[PDB]
Amino acid sequence: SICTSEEWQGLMQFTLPVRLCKEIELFHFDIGPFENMWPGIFVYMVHRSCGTSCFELEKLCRFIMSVKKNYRRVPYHNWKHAVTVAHCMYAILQNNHTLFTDLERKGLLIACLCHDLDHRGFSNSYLQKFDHPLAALYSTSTMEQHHFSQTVSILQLEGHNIFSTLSSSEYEQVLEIIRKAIIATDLALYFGNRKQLEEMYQTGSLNLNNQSHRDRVIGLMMTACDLCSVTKLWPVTKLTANDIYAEFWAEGDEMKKLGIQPIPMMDRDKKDEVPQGQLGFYNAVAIPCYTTLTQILPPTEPLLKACRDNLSQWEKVIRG
Ligand SMILES: Cc1ccc([C@H]2C[C@@H]2COc2cc(NCc3nnc(C)s3)nc(C)n2)nc1
């Protein structure tokens, strides 16, 4: 789908309220209440991370409005999820600016905006177990490969390629930065990645100059951004969780119509077990992630602090 003439023109003429400028720098920033400003917020973030001449303003505004039109109206993995994940990446980048190159900053902001592109509200297991065409095309990381394929297709639209002004080597480097960042958002790969990084940090062998290490660090940054709803203020973290489960329970509903027993996280009859399962996700997934990200990039400590606050909140729910 391509953005209409009206859409990209509209955000070229957008102006961000100076009250927001101070707020958007904080890790806990919730975008939720500013729906009309989401595309323009992405523009400001790109222009503050990689400068006013980062990309052609027309091309960038067309790209952004076409990415919005290709996210589906599903409960969680929607346009709103994309800007939230891109905002968290901007906050990480701003706080560690000279650790990343211009090309990495450009790639990661665009990778986050496009990372769940064209999501059907179905997990990789649903598509693989029910022999969906996408699973025959992509054996592993099924949706994550499709999201990359879709990202490349928006760049192949008339006047959308924000990267063509890069040298041929810079272009292939950015397209590989994006492919790897998007694949790292498949939570199945996260556990292995975090284990290796924890190992390299403890032993003292982690070296950001080593491209293999750099790729794993970027991957952990993408996970942290993907799950950042656990780093928001408790009321926000709570309302987002209702959206996550609205999408998980809708997948389990499709399995129940096909005579299939879903796991408890995708079963709406198992709502009571959500506080306990959220506690488990914080203990095994969220806390380790932000703990390792803070060890590597100490300015990202507020993410570990906020995640720890919501862990204490989920424990409070469980206790009564
Ligand atoms: C009964 C029971 C058992 C276990 C669980 C917990 C594992 C789930 C909690 O999963 C998540 C996933 C997630 N982000 C990735 C996503 N993938 N697809 C989406 C849709 S959200 N972010 C958060 C805050 N929580 N819940 C209930």
Ligand SMILES: [Mg+2]
């Ligand atoms: Mg995803």
Ligand SMILES: [Zn+2]
């Ligand atoms: Zn995501």
